[PDB]
Enzyme design. Structure first.
Site, PDB file in Angstrom:
ATOM      1  N   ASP A  25       0.812  -1.218   0.000  1.00 16.03           N
ATOM      2  CA  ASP A  25       0.000   0.000   0.000  1.00 16.03           C
ATOM      3  C   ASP A  25       0.847   1.272   0.000  1.00 16.03           C
ATOM      4  O   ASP A  25       1.294   1.759   1.051  1.00 16.03           O
ATOM      5  CB  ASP A  25      -0.943  -0.024   1.206  1.00 16.03           C
ATOM      6  CG  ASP A  25      -1.997   1.049   1.150  1.00 16.03           C
ATOM      7  OD1 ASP A  25      -1.794   2.042   0.421  1.00 16.03           O
ATOM      8  OD2 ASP A  25      -3.046   0.888   1.826  1.00 16.03           O
ATOM      9  N   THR A  26       1.018   1.849  -1.186  1.00 14.71           N
ATOM     10  CA  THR A  26       1.853   3.034  -1.312  1.00 14.71           C
ATOM     11  C   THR A  26       1.195   4.288  -0.742  1.00 14.71           C
ATOM     12  O   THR A  26       1.877   5.302  -0.530  1.00 14.71           O
ATOM     13  CB  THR A  26       2.254   3.311  -2.776  1.00 14.71           C
ATOM     14  OG1 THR A  26       1.079   3.524  -3.582  1.00 14.71           O
ATOM     15  CG2 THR A  26       3.041   2.150  -3.348  1.00 14.71           C
ATOM     16  N   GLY A  27      -0.113   4.225  -0.493  1.00  9.58           N
ATOM     17  CA  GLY A  27      -0.824   5.343   0.111  1.00  9.58           C
ATOM     18  C   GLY A  27      -0.734   5.361   1.617  1.00  9.58           C
ATOM     19  O   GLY A  27      -1.154   6.331   2.235  1.00  9.58           O
TER      20      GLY A  27
HETATM   21  N1  LIG Z   1     -11.745   2.292  -1.987  1.00  7.80           N
HETATM   22  C1  LIG Z   1     -10.816   3.241  -2.053  1.00  7.80           C
HETATM   23  O1  LIG Z   1     -10.495   3.731  -3.125  1.00  7.80           O
HETATM   24  C2  LIG Z   1     -10.150   3.749  -0.797  1.00  7.80           C
HETATM   25  C3  LIG Z   1      -9.972   2.937   0.321  1.00  7.80           C
HETATM   26  C4  LIG Z   1      -9.353   3.440   1.472  1.00  7.80           C
HETATM   27  C5  LIG Z   1      -8.893   4.753   1.512  1.00  7.80           C
HETATM   28  S1  LIG Z   1      -8.148   5.353   2.824  1.00  7.80           S
HETATM   29  O2  LIG Z   1      -8.388   4.551   3.993  1.00  7.80           O
HETATM   30  O3  LIG Z   1      -8.514   6.730   2.993  1.00  7.80           O
HETATM   31  N2  LIG Z   1      -6.663   5.273   2.466  1.00  7.80           N
HETATM   32  C6  LIG Z   1      -5.933   6.425   1.945  1.00  7.80           C
HETATM   33  C7  LIG Z   1      -5.349   7.188   3.125  1.00  7.80           C
HETATM   34  C8  LIG Z   1      -4.119   7.943   2.653  1.00  7.80           C
HETATM   35  C9  LIG Z   1      -3.884   9.154   3.520  1.00  7.80           C
HETATM   36  C10 LIG Z   1      -4.645   9.364   4.667  1.00  7.80           C
HETATM   37  C11 LIG Z   1      -4.412  10.493   5.449  1.00  7.80           C
HETATM   38  C12 LIG Z   1      -3.425  11.399   5.080  1.00  7.80           C
HETATM   39  C13 LIG Z   1      -2.663  11.180   3.939  1.00  7.80           C
HETATM   40  C14 LIG Z   1      -2.889  10.054   3.158  1.00  7.80           C
HETATM   41  C15 LIG Z   1      -5.992   3.964   2.537  1.00  7.80           C
HETATM   42  C16 LIG Z   1      -5.794   3.448   1.103  1.00  7.80           C
HETATM   43  N3  LIG Z   1      -4.350   3.311   0.944  1.00  7.80           N
HETATM   44  C17 LIG Z   1      -3.612   3.943   2.013  1.00  7.80           C
HETATM   45  C18 LIG Z   1      -4.606   4.027   3.156  1.00  7.80           C
HETATM   46  N4  LIG Z   1      -4.486   2.855   4.002  1.00  7.80           N
HETATM   47  C19 LIG Z   1      -5.119   2.890   5.312  1.00  7.80           C
HETATM   48  C20 LIG Z   1      -4.133   3.603   6.195  1.00  7.80           C
HETATM   49  C21 LIG Z   1      -4.400   4.868   6.708  1.00  7.80           C
HETATM   50  C22 LIG Z   1      -3.443   5.487   7.504  1.00  7.80           C
HETATM   51  C23 LIG Z   1      -2.245   4.831   7.772  1.00  7.80           C
HETATM   52  C24 LIG Z   1      -1.186   5.450   8.620  1.00  7.80           C
HETATM   53  F1  LIG Z   1      -1.575   6.622   9.081  1.00  7.80           F
HETATM   54  F2  LIG Z   1      -0.877   4.653   9.627  1.00  7.80           F
HETATM   55  F3  LIG Z   1      -0.126   5.581   7.847  1.00  7.80           F
HETATM   56  C25 LIG Z   1      -1.991   3.572   7.256  1.00  7.80           C
HETATM   57  C26 LIG Z   1      -2.939   2.958   6.464  1.00  7.80           C
HETATM   58  C27 LIG Z   1      -9.069   5.554   0.386  1.00  7.80           C
HETATM   59  C28 LIG Z   1      -9.692   5.060  -0.761  1.00  7.80           C
END
Ligand SMILES: NC(=O)c1ccc(S(=O)(=O)N(CCCc2ccccc2)[C@H]2CNC[C@@H]2NCc2ccc(C(F)(F)F)cc2)cc1
Ligand SMILES: [Cl-]
Ligand SMILES: [Cl-]
Ligand SMILES: [Cl-]
EC number: 3.4.23.16
Lengths: 99, 99
Positions: A25-27
């Site tokens: 998970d690059t996000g």
């Molecule tokens: N179905 C979809 O397309 C979908 C699914 C899930 C998400 S999500 O949960 O919001 N979402 C994006 C969140 C990215 C982000 C959040 C806050 C600030 C900057 C960046 C997901 C999807 N891939 C990454 C992120 N994974 C969950 C996550 C959130 C936070 C952390 C931490 F804070 F610990 F690092 C770890 C894991 C977003 C979109």
């Protein structure tokens, strides 16, 4: 390896002596694993995104094997819907995005 | 390009003639953009994030440029922490994970 994105990039990992399926998970800044036991001290942390925040336990200096590659770093443990390998460990295995 | 993961993989996108910042997110099935005006009819969609499930607006066949690469596909609009380029469009631009 090269992994396409037609489906979720799921891999098998080994952590705390257990095999689990996890998403590359690059996000994600951080690695987040469903409830399990880990050694060492921990501190609470809140992580969030779509749908809001959850509370997790932060463990440091945890070893994880991902596709034959051992990496060490922080692992967060809590009620995540899916096991997540975040950037903190993806860097350690030399994972890049390419297009 | 080849993008390493020591920092968030943020890129510039163009949608509706406007430049925005977005995250290349292999953990996201879908592409989710902050509130903005898009053309055409929308359909309802529920997506699950780290913190729970939410409703967003689904627009199909939307023109979007990602790091200079043209794509045309489904864009969701809703309360996302950051603009997210998910697998549906990462696949269109030929993005893979490599290690
Ligand atoms: N179905 C979809 O397309 C979908 C699914 C899930 C998400 S999500 O949960 O919001 N979402 C994006 C969140 C990215 C982000 C959040 C806050 C600030 C900057 C960046 C997901 C999807 N891939 C990454 C992120 N994974 C969950 C996550 C959130 C936070 C952390 C931490 F804070 F610990 F690092 C770890 C894991 C977003 C979109
Ligand atoms: Cl770390
Ligand atoms: Cl609705
Ligand atoms: Cl699409």
């Amino acid at each position: 390896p090269q992994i396409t994105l037609w489906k979720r990039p799921l891999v098998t990992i080994k952590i705390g002596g257990q095999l689990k399926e996890a998403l590359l998970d690059t996000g994600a800044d951080d690695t987040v694993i469903e409830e399990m036991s880990l050694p060492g001290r921990w501190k609470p942390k809140m992580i969030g995104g779509i749908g809001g925040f959850i509370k997790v336990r932060q463990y440091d200096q945890i070893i994880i094997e991902i596709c034959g590659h051992k990496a060490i770093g922080t692992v967060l443990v809590g009620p995540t819907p899916v096991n997540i390998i975040g950037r903190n460990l993806l860097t350690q295995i030399g994972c890049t995005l390419n297009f």
